[PDB]
From a paper:
NoVs are encapsulated by a protein capsid that is assembled by a single major structural protein, the [name] VP1. VP1 is divided into the N-terminal shell (S) and the C-terminal protruding (P) domain, forming the interior shell and the multiple protrusions of the capsid, respectively. HuNoVs interact with histo-blood group antigens (HBGAs) in a strain-specific manner. In this study, through X-ray crystallography of the P domain of a GII.21 huNoV ([name]) we identified a unique lineage in GII consisting of GII.13 and GII.21 genotypes that recognize HBGAs through a binding interface distinct from the GII conventional binding interface.
The crystal of the native P domain protein belongs to the P21 space group, with two monomers forming a dimer in an asymmetric unit. The final refined structure of native P domain includes residues 223 to 527, with the exception of a loop region comprising residues 340~342 due to the lack of recognizable electron density. The two monomers of the [name] P dimer are related by a non-crystallographic two-fold axis, which forms the biologically active protrusion of the NoV capsid. The P dimer has a dimension of 55 Å×64 Å×70 Å with an extensively buried interface of 3,500 Å2 between two protomers, including hydrophobic and hydrophilic interacting residues from both P1 and P2 subdomains. The P-loop of the [name] P dimer exhibits a unique conformation, taking a ~90° flip, which results in its extruding out of the flat surface and approaching the opposite protomer. As a result, the majority of the S-loop is covered in the [name] virus. Such structural rearrangements destroy the structural integrity of the conventional GII [name] binding interfaces that are formed mainly by P- and S-loops. On the other hand, the B- and the T-loops also exhibit unique conformations, approaching to each other in closer proximity with the N-loop. This special structural feature allows the formation of new [name] binding interface (see below), formed by the B-, T- and N-loops, a scenario that is absent in all other known GII huNoV structures. Analysis of the native [name] P domain structure revealed that a glycerol molecule occupies the [name] binding pocket, which was clearly visible from the 2Fo-Fc omit map. The glycerol molecule is held firmly inside the [name] binding pocket by eight direct hydrogen bonds between the hydroxyl groups of the glycerol and the side chains of N392, N394 and T395 from the T-loop, T356 and the main chain of S357 from the N-loop. Interestingly, the glycerol molecule resembles partial structures (C2, C3, and C4 with their hydroxyl groups) of the β-Gal that contributes the vast majority of the interactions with the binding pocket (Compare Fig 5F with Fig 7C), thus explaining the observed interactions.
Numbering used by the authors:
A (entry chain B): 221 to 527
B (entry chain A): 222 to 527
Write the structure that this text describes.
């Protein structure tokens, strides 16, 4: 008995980004000529193998948990956070992982709120500090078990069990948001380890199709766009189903149930990403009620209908 | 007939459906004299969502819309004119208690409001800490508006805004009451379209909850939020839509390595679990275990005691 492969039935307004906790807003395609596309969150094979720093919960993506240090006396990261995995499991740096699960996989400033010991303090927001976690910081060393926290609203308490809840991205004069550049998980000038592989098209006329979110920008005017290979719900679905991949390429179609007609077709690669026959950098427009659907296994030679 | 199933997810692989946080514990209580009628995390076993329940973790206790002009109110300095979290237009005539994901407790929800992106040398320029009290007279989400009380930074008027939840606050006059519903239209108007109240209706049984210890941002006590089924079960039932064969699915919490059943429970068609137990306490489970569907049983099926 061979279990058939399937996608969940979810419209674009029913999908979550697997690289930042936000709904999908757009589908987007680009040749990405001058970058290497190698995200570490939102990585799952079609047969259900999680890779990189990928885990199952939306709440763990770009989240951190652990114990704060004593003050560092550093100009930027006034405290460190000694990490456990988001599920609370002890983190062993010798694990065959790039970093704890859910660690941010871009170079940029992640903004969110650190919460620590409940306080009898009579102040509003007493136990909620706004913090910047820059993955260009010299103290961003999650592979080693520690990251730097730069407080921006309130004061971080030393030596307390703490949770970081992500909210958005900040950009400053020396820290552009670079979604396709990985952090150096062990610190400046070190080599990343245990990475999910880079992805790209391998058929003439094809480009990757991404699930895109415009996430909150808390400093700077540039809209912050984060592209994932598959949405978090697909990670969860493939993990659950673990259907055997019967070829290297699944043919999927985007259907409009209002008309019963498909809008476009695409290849969903066994590695866990989508390509389409398209050129240029632009959104791919879909009807709000439409959804992706698995139609059949095909092979590397299947020529897609162009968009 | 399509077989009913539960997803294979351990306790550390589950999300609270009433607040965006991982499940920390299973927990049981008699909840004496208290009506348990949450509106998030509500889904029947054949995949019908109820109350304000929707599918995304990111929409739970989140809000989206346009801020008003300054109100000059003592507490809610701005209103937020709501759409649903997915951006779909909301209107009060929808057959829902309130926009999807609206908080379903009486208390202060703390989080961050983000608005128009703008170039600035100021850190956190476009991220304001805000309290959304569901006990406020301005908390009328069924009518399309809620009140925002700023606590960190200044809210901008007339801007498209998103609220990202972070935790719960207890201030001088707002105890947290997880089982008391907002008056979604204000106290003078009845709530509508509610997912039904749940309870054991069986001597010696209690509800088993999926519990999260969520961030407590003001007040010295920890805050616990209990849901009837985790968000992943809502998602699973919605997709599968397996027809129910009775009112009660017998389920067993199993350890897949030892092969042992830890306990059995009744998963009710309405979308909640009961166990044969008395008292208020955690229900301890192996970290590698999970509920497994056993069989559909009679609506009056009796359980082995915990």
């Amino acid at each position: 008995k061979t279990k058939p492969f399937t996608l969940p039935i979810l419209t674009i307004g029913e999908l979550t980004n697997s690289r930042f906790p936000a709904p999908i807003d757009q589908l987007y395609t680009s040749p990405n000529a001058d970058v290497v596309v190698q995200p570490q969150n939102g990585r799952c094979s079609l047969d259900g193998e999680l890779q990189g720093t990928t885990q199952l919960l939306t709440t763990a993506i770009c989240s951190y948990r652990g114990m704060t240090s004593n003050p560092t006396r550093d100009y930027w990261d006034g405290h460190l956070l000694h990490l456990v995995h988001p599920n609370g499991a002890t983190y062993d740096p010798t694990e065959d992982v790039p970093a704890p699960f859910g660690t941010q996989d871009f170079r940029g400033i992640l903004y969110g709120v650190l919460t620590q010991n409940p306080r009898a303090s009579g102040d509003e927001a007493a136990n909620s500090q706004g913090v910047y976690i820059s993955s260009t910081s010299e103290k961003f060393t999650p592979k080693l078990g520690t990251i730097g926290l730069h407080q921006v609203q309130g004061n971080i308490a030393s030596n307390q069990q703490s949770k970081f809840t992500p909210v958005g991205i900040a950009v400053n004069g020396n820290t552009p948001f670079r979604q396709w550049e990985l952090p150096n998980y062990s610190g400046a000038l070190t080599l990343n380890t245990n990475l999910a592989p880079a992805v790209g098209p391998n058929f003439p006329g094809e480009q990757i199709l991404f699930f895109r979110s415009n996430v909150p920008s808390v400093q700077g005017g540039q809209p912050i766009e984060i592209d994932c290979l598959i949405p978090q719900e697909w990670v969860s679905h493939f993990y659950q189903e673990s259907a055997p991949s019967q070829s290297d390429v699944a043919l999927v179609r985007y259907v409009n149930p209002d008309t019963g007609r498909t809008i476009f077709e695409a290849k969903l690669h066994r590695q866990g990403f989508i390509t389409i026959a398209a050129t240029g950098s632009n959104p791919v427009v879909v009807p709000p009620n439409g959804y992706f659907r698995f139609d059949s296994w095909v092979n590397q030679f299947y020529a897609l209908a162009p968009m």
